[PDB]
């Protein structure tokens, strides 16, 4: 009669090597990640039956290095349904 | 009757090898990255039954290396569905 | 009678090999990236029944280097379906 | 006459070497990440029947060195279902 | 009649092996994350039969190092349901 | 007749080594997290039937160095299921 399922099958396999060797004197420098943002700084939504999904990321700096090498699922999702005023699925 | 199914199979198979081999004396300089952003500054939405989906992204500075390297999923998704007024599904 | 079934199957396979081998001295610089942005700046939506997606995206800087060799499915997505106003769907 | 069955099965295989071999004297310096965010600083949502999902991230620096090798589901999801208004599902 | 089962299954599975070995003398320096944020200062949501997911997240500074190698499953979750304004699920 | 079975399966099985070894003179100096956040300061929700899911978190400074390197699981959870305004399920 009714039947509701909500099912996720994540299957992830990696097979792989991350040899690194470095023999010789080496110098790496990545300095100086000051970014200056100023936002909406030094100056002189939705009504009654809706559905309503928002996002306001601010980031000042992000810096990622030798990461992630294999199968980098990180954030992941599906499915996003956000519904709004009354929802009816009706059988006669 | 009725029968409303989510369904998400994800299946990612990586095989690789990332061999990274320096044998001689090197030199990396990625510094500076420092962007003034400066965004509404120093100056002098929606009704009764909708849906909406807003987003405002703001990033100073990113800086990936060496990442990544097989198979990233990262910020995967499906299926967004934002709905408003009231949704109706009837058979007779 | 109903059968509503929202699916997505992302089956991704990668096979290879990166091999990076660096025999003599080298140098590398990528120094430098302060873009200045000023936006809106130092100066002297939608009604009643209604879907709405709005995206504003800002960046300074973005630098990616030796990142994604393989099947990068990053940010993947599907189906984005913004309904406002109200939805019916009816059989007689 | 009613199924509801919400199943998530998630099967991570990884299998990998990481060999990281340094010979040589080496300098690495990634310092300086005081990004300055000021937001909404030094100036002189929904009704009744609805389904809101909002998220505001600020973040000032984030930073990831030698990090998430393999297999990193980190922060996974799935269905995220917001639902508003009161469901109805009925057969007769 | 009636059978409601929520069910998870999370097998992870890694083998891999990290050997990190320094011949030589090396220096790393990583100073100075003071991100200064300074959030709406110094400056002269939802009604009846609702559902809603709000988040807020304000992160000063996050710095990860040599971290997460194998299988990361941190902060993982699924099927989040958030329903409002009364659920029926009816057979006859 | 009825069977409501809430069940939840978690196998991790990780098998690796991490042989760290550093044969020569070193020196490491991450010093300096003092982000200074200001939120909201210095300056002159839901009504009768819901379900809502609120999370405000707010952390100055994290740092995580030579950590999980294994299996990782920290954190983890599933179906979250939110329900406000009183549940039905009937069969006839």
Do not use: M
């Not at 690194?20 to 700084?41: C, D, H, M, N, T």
């Amino acid at each position: 009669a009714v039947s509701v399922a909500l099912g996720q099958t994540v299957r992830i396999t990696c097979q792989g090597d991350s040899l690194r060797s470095y023999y010789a004197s080496w110098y790496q420098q990545k300095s100086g990640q000051a970014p200056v943002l100023v936002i909406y700084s030094y100056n002189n939504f939705s009504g009654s039956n809706s559905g309503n999904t928002a996002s306001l990321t601010i980031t000042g700096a992000q810096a990622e290095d030798e990461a992630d090498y294999y199968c980098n699922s990180r954030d992941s999702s599906g499915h996003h349904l956000v519904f709004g005023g009354g929802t009816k699925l009706t059988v006669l």
